[PDB]
Amino acid sequence: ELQKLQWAKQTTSICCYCAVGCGLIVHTAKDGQGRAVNVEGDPDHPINEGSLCPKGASIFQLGENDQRGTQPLYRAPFSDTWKPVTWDFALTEIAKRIKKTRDASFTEKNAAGDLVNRTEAIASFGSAAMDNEECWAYGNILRSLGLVYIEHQARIXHSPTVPALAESFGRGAMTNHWNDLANSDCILIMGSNAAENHPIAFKWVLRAKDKGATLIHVDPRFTRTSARCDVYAPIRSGADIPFLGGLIKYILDNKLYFTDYVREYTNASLIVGEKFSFKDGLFSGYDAANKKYDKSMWAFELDANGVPKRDPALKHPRCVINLLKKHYERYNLDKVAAITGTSKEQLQQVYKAYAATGKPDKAGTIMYAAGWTQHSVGVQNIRAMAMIQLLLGNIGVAGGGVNALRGESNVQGSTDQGLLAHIWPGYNPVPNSKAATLELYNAATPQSKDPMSVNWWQNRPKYVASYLKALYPDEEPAAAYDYLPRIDAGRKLTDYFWLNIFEKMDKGEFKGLFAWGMNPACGGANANKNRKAMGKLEWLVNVNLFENETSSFWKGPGMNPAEIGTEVFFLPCCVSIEKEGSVANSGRWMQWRYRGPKPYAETKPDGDIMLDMFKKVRELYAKEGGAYPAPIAKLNIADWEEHNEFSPTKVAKLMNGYFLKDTEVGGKQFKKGQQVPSFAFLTADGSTCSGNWLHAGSFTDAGNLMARRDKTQTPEQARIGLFPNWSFCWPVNRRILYNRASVDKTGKPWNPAKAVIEWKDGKWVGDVVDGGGDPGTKHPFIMQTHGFGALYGPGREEGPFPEHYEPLECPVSKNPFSKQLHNPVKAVCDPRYPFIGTTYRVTEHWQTGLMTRRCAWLVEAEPQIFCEISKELAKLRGIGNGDTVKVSSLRGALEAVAIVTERIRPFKIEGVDVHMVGLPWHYGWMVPKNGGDTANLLTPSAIPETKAFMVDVRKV
Amino acid sequence: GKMFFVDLSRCTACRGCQIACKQWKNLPAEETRNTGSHQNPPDLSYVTLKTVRFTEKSRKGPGIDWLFFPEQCRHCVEPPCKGQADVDLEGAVVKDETTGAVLFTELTAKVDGESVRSACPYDIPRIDPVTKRLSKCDMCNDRVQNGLLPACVKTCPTGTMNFGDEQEMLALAEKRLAEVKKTYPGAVLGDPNDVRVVYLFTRDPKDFYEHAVA
Numbered sequence A: 001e002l003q004k005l006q007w008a009k010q011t012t013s014i015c016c017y018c019a020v021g022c023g024l025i026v027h028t029a030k031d032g033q034g035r036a037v038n039v040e041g042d043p044d045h046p047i048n049e050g051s052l053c054p055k056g057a058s059i060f061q062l063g064e065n066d067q068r069g070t071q072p073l074y075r076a077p078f079s080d081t082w083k084p085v086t087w088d089f090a091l092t093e094i095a096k097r098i099k100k101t102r103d104a105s106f107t108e109k110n111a112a113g114d115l116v117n118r119t120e121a122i123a124s125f126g127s128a129a130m131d132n133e134e135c136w137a138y139g140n141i142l143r144s145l146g147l148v149y150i151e152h153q154a155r156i157x158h159s160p161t162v163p164a165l166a167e168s169f170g171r172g173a174m175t176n177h178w179n180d181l182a183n184s185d186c187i188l189i190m191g192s193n194a195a196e197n198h199p200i201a202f203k204w205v206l207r208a209k210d211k212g213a214t215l216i217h218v219d220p221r222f223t224r225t226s227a228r229c230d231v232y233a234p235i236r237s238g239a240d241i242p243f244l245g246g247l248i249k250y251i252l253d254n255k256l257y258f259t260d261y262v263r264e265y266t267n268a269s270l271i272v273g274e275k276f277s278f279k280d281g282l283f284s285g286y287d288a289a290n291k292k293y294d295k296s297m298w299a300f301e302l303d304a305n306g307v308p309k310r311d312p313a314l315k316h317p318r319c320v321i322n323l324l325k326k327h328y329e330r331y332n333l334d335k336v337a338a339i340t341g342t343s344k345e346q347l348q349q350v351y352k353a354y355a356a357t358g359k360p361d362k363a364g365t366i367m368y369a370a371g372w373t374q375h376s377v378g379v380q381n382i383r384a385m386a387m388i389q390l391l392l393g394n395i396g397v398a399g400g401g402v403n404a405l406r407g408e409s410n411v412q413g414s415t416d417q418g419l420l421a422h423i424w425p426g427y428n429p430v431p432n433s434k435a436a437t438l439e440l441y442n443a444a445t446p447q448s449k450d451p452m453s454v455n456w457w458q459n460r461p462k463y464v465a466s467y468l469k470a471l472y473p474d475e476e477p478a479a480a481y482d483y484l485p486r487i488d489a490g491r492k493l494t495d496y497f498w499l500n501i502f503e504k505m506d507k508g509e510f511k512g513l514f515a516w517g518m519n520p521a522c523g524g525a526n527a528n529k530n531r532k533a534m535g536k537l538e539w540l541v542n543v544n545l546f547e548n549e550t551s552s553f554w555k556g557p558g559m560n561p562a563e564i565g566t567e568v569f570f571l572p573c574c575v576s577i578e579k580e581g582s583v584a585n586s587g588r589w590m591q592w593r594y595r596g597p598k599p600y601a602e603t604k605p606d607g608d609i610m611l612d613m614f615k616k617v618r619e620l621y622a623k624e625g626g627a628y629p630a631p632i633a634k635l636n637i638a639d640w641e642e643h644n645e646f647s648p649t650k651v652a653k654l655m656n657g658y659f660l661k662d663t664e665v666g667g668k669q670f671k672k673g674q675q676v677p678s679f680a681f682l683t684a685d686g687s688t689c690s691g692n693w694l695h696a697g698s699f700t701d702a703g704n705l706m707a708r709r710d711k712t713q714t715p716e717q718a719r720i721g722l723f724p725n726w727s728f729c730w731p732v733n734r735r736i737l738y739n740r741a742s743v744d745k746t747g748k749p750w751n752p753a754k755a756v757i758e759w760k761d762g763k764w765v766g767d768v769v770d771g772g773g774d775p776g777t778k779h780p781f782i783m784q785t786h787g788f789g790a791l792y793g794p795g796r797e798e799g800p801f802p803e804h805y806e807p808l809e810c811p812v813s814k815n816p817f818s819k820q821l822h823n824p825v826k827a828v829c830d831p832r833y834p835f836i837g838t839t840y841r842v843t844e845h846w847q848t849g850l851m852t853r854r855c856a857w858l859v860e861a862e863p864q865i866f867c868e869i870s871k872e873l874a875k876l877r878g879i880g881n882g883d884t885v886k887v888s889s890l891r892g893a894l895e896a897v898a899i900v901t902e903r904i905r906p907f908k909i910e911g912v913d914v915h916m917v918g919l920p921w922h923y924g925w926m927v928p929k930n931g932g933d934t935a936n937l938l939t940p941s942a943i944p945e946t947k948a949f950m951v952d953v954r955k956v
Numbered sequence B: 001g002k003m004f005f006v007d008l009s010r011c012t013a014c015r016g017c018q019i020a021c022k023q024w025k026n027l028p029a030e031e032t033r034n035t036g037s038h039q040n041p042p043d044l045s046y047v048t049l050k051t052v053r054f055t056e057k058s059r060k061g062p063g064i065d066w067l068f069f070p071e072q073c074r075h076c077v078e079p080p081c082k083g084q085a086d087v088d089l090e091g092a093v094v095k096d097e098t099t100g101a102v103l104f105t106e107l108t109a110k111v112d113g114e115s116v117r118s119a120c121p122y123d124i125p126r127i128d129p130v131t132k133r134l135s136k137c138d139m140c141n142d143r144v145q146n147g148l149l150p151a152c153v154k155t156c157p158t159g160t161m162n163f164g165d166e167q168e169m170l171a172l173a174e175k176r177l178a179e180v181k182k183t184y185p186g187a188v189l190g191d192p193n194d195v196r197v198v199y200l201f202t203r204d205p206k207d208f209y210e211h212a213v214a
């Protein structure tokens, strides 16, 4: 017996850091009644198999940490200290400030007289770190109070991915899952440092190599990832589209595409309208006045049924494939090598290694994150990779996919619960001011007259109605539709997002900010603008584990509390292992975790903080009245609580949804109150509620499928690592999306040794088939209007095909592919700042470091902010390895330890050496001592530009 | 009867093992500063039983050979540290018959710790400047006796860390050296008949660390 664990209760949990979703085992003193005594990995968990990176490994020290908040704190306007206070004080006083600001600012109708029922004097930040039930309840609270300025992490992380992959495949999510990486024949990691930033992924990447895969790292820096790859290939920052363009030309020139896949499953055969053209860097329909495009000019030529025309022979010169061949002929190896600064030899090696997966019985995968998403390219960059993956027949197959690596543990789930300004839960758009009725809202959904296009989004009316029923069960959906706030139709959609919220804040056009599980005083670009801007708030609600640079902006560097009139409430939430609920991993796996210890001190789950806060707003409205109270009074919170606290279970069941009455649907009979078994049984008529149609099938009458921990697998499932009885993923336990494309028209896999689905005795066997129907009867991309993987994407702002427009303004003066230098849809480049700053992560720290700067073992490994430079820039500026350096820019300056390393090398741009300097953004002024402040003192706020910004570096 | 096989051709220098050593034994963190390396702590100490050493080596073309060395007592089949301390006070250093673990006891405060370190051809032993106790990796002998993997092994996600019966671990090292040599032609096993922690290096062990091998 191990004494340490002998008298402790053992529970399972899920890592609270990155989106791999590692399994934990927690040991709690006094058989549950005390503090946590131990946290290590869950050896039965099929993702990590007991392994933890140092973030997961150190979760004991995160939880049992004497620096953690114990009770609410109050900061008085112009005050220079905190005063500890009661929950009941801070919540009631908070509930007041909400009602005050709302009643004062609430607008029933915009300038144009359209119903909107909203307030623009309160904004909310966060959070990808709360449980899925907390995210869903949080969103619905903010929307009953009529907020529209609702945002989190997701907008900087992966806001390019969702539209790029939705354009390409019809869904925004990572296409495969972590275990499936082991099935790849070639793994390309580009715009990702997965060995440091998704470490347990490397379990499966290295198992892929064991089975004969080539691993390829394409990065401007040599990293811990590069050290364990077969091919390291340097690429200068922002040259990715030239790189992926060459690969597209390489695949066509050499006839390495999967022809049958391309013919049948992509839009290769669709005929584009004669209005489509491209010349000297501009597609047709361009308007030079507005710096904007007329996408109608790109539409497909339609048959007399409304259905896009098709030449299955692929002969017609307006075939997508023929237009694509023509567009990418300009991307030859000499131009591509020149601009990427990657040798011709290395480009040839990578192209050959990756295009070899064009073979039916070979699969290649791309892994990317912020190296792609935080450049200006970003969307067209991800479009290029998707197009390559469709050319090679890599989408729907084991070891294939686009593996868009999500960041935070529940950023997938926070996104799914609509914690962005443009989406409700389930990705139903926030109605705009011109959507004056639910009928109009539903009329905006595109239709298809193609009998083979499933076109699943046509079921939207059932989801939106079921949603409105979940919030407002005693109202008709058409009536409930007037409670929720709307955005202006006449307005730039980005005017509601992160970057603009900070611009609005700095013009004092907000009274209140919720900083809920986010640290913007370190996270947002141009920290100095933001730290000032937060002073122009009247009140601030910060909900976090520890006091931080956000809660305490008012006593930060060069700030005088006396000057600063902002009233701050600090509410201490509990850690992941102190509460129950679900987090959704990058693979879409929705995983249940349990309470180990009771909340430290007087900390509360976020679900209790926000529910109680809303109860104090509700009764404040019920006693005093005020602005349009019905949406607050009418909201069904009864279904969210049990024994006087937030109920994760109950909230989860409401998200899945249940029949509000005795109902017949899809020719089955259902009893009132019965749990909804799948989104296929939701109705538009109010028979059914569901907080999120994606969650329908997650908590059925069968039980909580998210809490399953069953490793049962058929031979075919176990061959590729589906683990369908471990937890649950949306939609309806489809582990690999678009898997209908993994088989021919008879239902036989392209690669029988690695089948995802197979047609056997009149049924699909293996994964859950992504869309019902017999083999050869349905187009495989069911969320697409037309049913196809889009090579040609006529709904994308920058044009239907990715095109290289120079992301780097300052050091690049000419484009080798056109006469359009920059993106045809302001950086000063002051010569005092001659080097290219970039920010990025290390394995040991997390985000702004709020969490990891408070764990002694993580600071031990990585105690201070560093600046990585080449020997060339070291020799030039006379900097020695370990010297203190000042890094500066138009926005700010800071101090950092020099790491001189051959792992950085200067870019060769237009004849001249360009030096790139690297900083981590894991540092802030609060803690630890000599740690340093954020790298975002240096970055500009012009989804912002954090992977390339002009600095100088000097020895102190 | 137990051996670690440590395949350094699989290490991501994620430093799971380093953190997981401390979490399991509830060791404290050192005062550290960055002196121009990711490496930290810079060396083994009375409170650090394992650190990951980083070495950057030049190579022709893009990139570097970045050598990662997660250092621990090798649990020698013939402990020189015992031999040294056994002639000052026998019992201060012990060998577990069961596991093969070499263990430093509370009685190491009553020897020439300093000279027990010198006997160590791997420069592993470390001294408490107060109690004069000697500390080092104890093989998680606790957990092994209970039939748990050692913390540093269970935590490692890459397949670098491996543990079990000598026969099975030697067999595996043999077989894995053969496959790894296909990618890293100069791959060798560290002192594979002398020790119970058998490192696979991708090249000259001395590039990973001065005291990598005897």
Ligand SMILES: Nc1nc2c(c(=O)[nH]1)N[C@H]1C(S)=C(S)[C@@H](COP(=O)(O)OP(=O)(O)OC[C@H]3O[C@@H](n4cnc5c(=O)[nH]c(N)nc54)[C@H](O)[C@@H]3O)O[C@H]1N2
Binding pocket: A018, A157, A190, A191, A192, A193, A194, A196, A197, A198, A218, A219, A220, A221, A223, A235, A236, A237, A238, A239, A240, A368, A369, A370, A371, A372, A375, A406, A407, A408, A838, A839, A840, A841, A842, A843, A844, A845, A846, A847, A848, A947
């Ligand atoms: N340890 C740790 N892990 C994390 C996080 C963390 O803070 N710490 N954060 C999580 C979050 S929220 C996210 S979004 C992900 C992000 O995960 P990553 O995307 O891996 O994040 P970074 O390390 O910022 O950048 C990845 C790589 O992109 C490279 N890069 C920079 N510019 C370019 C370019 O133009 N082209 C190419 N091809 N590469 C370029 C950088 O050199 C770097 O090696 O990580 C998640 N995981």
Ligand SMILES: Nc1nc2c(c(=O)[nH]1)N[C@H]1C(S)=C(S)[C@@H](COP(=O)(O)OP(=O)(O)OC[C@H]3O[C@@H](n4cnc5c(=O)[nH]c(N)nc54)[C@H](O)[C@@H]3O)O[C@H]1N2
Binding pocket: A016, A127, A129, A130, A131, A153, A154, A156, A157, A370, A374, A407, A516, A517, A518, A519, A520, A522, A523, A524, A525, A543, A544, A545, A546, A573, A574, A575, A576, A606, A839, A840, A846, A847, A848, A849, A850, A851, A921, A935, A936, A939, A946
């Ligand atoms: N220069 C630069 N800036 C960047 C980036 C970059 O690469 N470079 N990355 C950008 C990206 S991709 C992102 S996502 C943002 C992220 O930036 P933020 O999200 O603003 O950063 P953190 O606050 O560290 O994110 C995790 C937070 O979750 C909190 N948390 C953990 N558990 C809980 C819980 O149960 N409840 C609550 N309420 N909070 C909890 C932690 O205390 C911590 O504050 O930063 C962006 N900023």
Ligand code: SF4
Binding pocket: A015, A016, A017, A018, A019, A020, A021, A022, A048, A051, A052, A053, A054, A055, A056, A057, A198, A199, A200, A201
């Ligand atoms: S941070 Fe990511 S890789 Fe590391 S233990 Fe947690 S989930 Fe696993």
Ligand code: SF4
Binding pocket: B020, B021, B022, B024, B049, B050, B072, B136, B137, B138, B139, B140, B150, B151, B152, B153
């Ligand atoms: S075997 Fe145990 S004591 Fe030795 S280094 Fe690993 S975790 Fe630390």
Ligand code: SF4
Binding pocket: B072, B073, B074, B075, B076, B079, B080, B081, B082, B102, B119, B120, B121, B122, B123, B124, B125, B136
């Ligand atoms: S490595 Fe050194 S301290 Fe460890 S058993 Fe061998 S001689 Fe003893």
Ligand code: SF4
Binding pocket: B010, B011, B012, B013, B014, B015, B016, B017, B018, B052, B068, B070, B155, B156, B157, B158, B160, B161
């Ligand atoms: S945990 Fe494994 S992969 Fe990570 S540094 Fe330690 S040995 Fe290397």
Ligand SMILES: [Cl-]
Binding pocket: A163, A422
């Ligand atoms: Cl969008």
Ligand SMILES: [Cl-]
Binding pocket: A179, A180, A182, A183, A718, A719, A720, A721
């Ligand atoms: Cl597998």
Ligand SMILES: [S]
Binding pocket: A128, A153, A154, A157, A406, A407, A408, A411
């Ligand atoms: S994220």
Ligand SMILES: [W+6]
Binding pocket: A153, A156, A157, A158, A406, A407, A408
């Ligand atoms: W992110």
